[PDB]
Amino acid sequence: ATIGRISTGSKSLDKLLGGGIETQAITEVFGEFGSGKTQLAHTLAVMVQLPPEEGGLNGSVMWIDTENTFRPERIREIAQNRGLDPDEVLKHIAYARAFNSNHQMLLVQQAEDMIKELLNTDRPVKLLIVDSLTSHFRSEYIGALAERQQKLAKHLADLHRLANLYDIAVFVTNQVQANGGHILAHSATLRVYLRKGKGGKRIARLIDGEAVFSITEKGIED
């Protein structure tokens, strides 16, 4: 398949990304608590449902939530301010809460079943969100870094296989602050560092110019 792109909602961020986040790729956004990673996830879950003329892929979404941070009311707001019907937008987001890192890994295998079911339809899965990808692994493997890296590596390999096999954009978040970070090392297709700037602006930079945007009723925008 050709590489599809999903607009982030921000022209600035889209330019930095070459048009938007790519299908057949894992995009990892990392930064401190409160930097806006989950807001970007919510925005992408709406944008992907637009037609290509508006920066979407007419796509369905699957969302694995590890921190109980998914907010349907926020999806509704973004959808209503992106000219979409909020009920339709929510009906095309499949949502699951991961109880722990092992359940998170099983949910990726489960996601493949729904991906296959929708593959030949007019609303194939085009976006798989894992927010947060690392939080359970970090808490469960304190003092056991080598084992943590083994499990994360298999999890990321599973996500890669889905991205490439089914032409999906995988978008993952990773909280990194004071003294923290192996990030996801070199595993993601693309690493985006997100931070707060003056006056509530958010700033994004590719790791391996900078885009600037705001969090608004449209999700994010210039």
Q: Which residues bind ligand D48 (CB under 6 A)?
A: 62-64, 94-96, 107, 110-111, 114
* Cβ proximity to ligand D48, 116 vs 182, nearer residue: 116
* Cβ proximity to ligand D48, 69 vs 110, nearer residue: 110
Helix, strand, coil fractions of the chain, as percent rounded to 5: 40, 25, 35
CA distances 164 to 30, 46, 107, Å, are 22, 22, 18
Tell the smallest beta-carbon distance from residue 201 to ligand D48 (Å): 32
* Cβ proximity to ligand D48, 108 vs 194, nearer residue: 108
Q: Which residue is nearest to ligand D48 (CB)?
A: 96
* Residue 221: both structure tokens together: 């925008």
* Cβ proximity to ligand D48, 41 vs 176, nearer residue: 41
* Cβ proximity to ligand D48, 17 vs 98, nearer residue: 98
Give the number of other Cβ atoms within 10 Å of residue 166's Cβ.
Answer: 20
Tell the smallest beta-carbon distance from residue 119 to ligand D48 (Å): 15
Tell the smallest beta-carbon distance from residue 114 to ligand D48 (Å): 5
- Residue 15 sits at φ, ψ, to 5 deg, of -60, -45
Tell the smallest beta-carbon distance from residue 112 to ligand D48 (Å): 9
* Cβ proximity to ligand D48, 17 vs 130, nearer residue: 130
Query: Which stretch of DSSP H or E encloses residue 104?
Result: helix 101-118
CB 171 within 8 Å of CB 21: yes
CB 59 within 8 Å of CB 125: yes
Tell the smallest beta-carbon distance from residue 214 to ligand D48 (Å): 29
* Residue 94: both structure tokens together: 């499949």
Classify 7 in phi/psi space as left (phi over 0), alpha (psi -120 to 50) or beta. Answer: beta
Query: Which stretch of DSSP H or E encloses residue 112?
Result: helix 101-118
Tell the smallest beta-carbon distance from residue 130 to ligand D48 (Å): 9
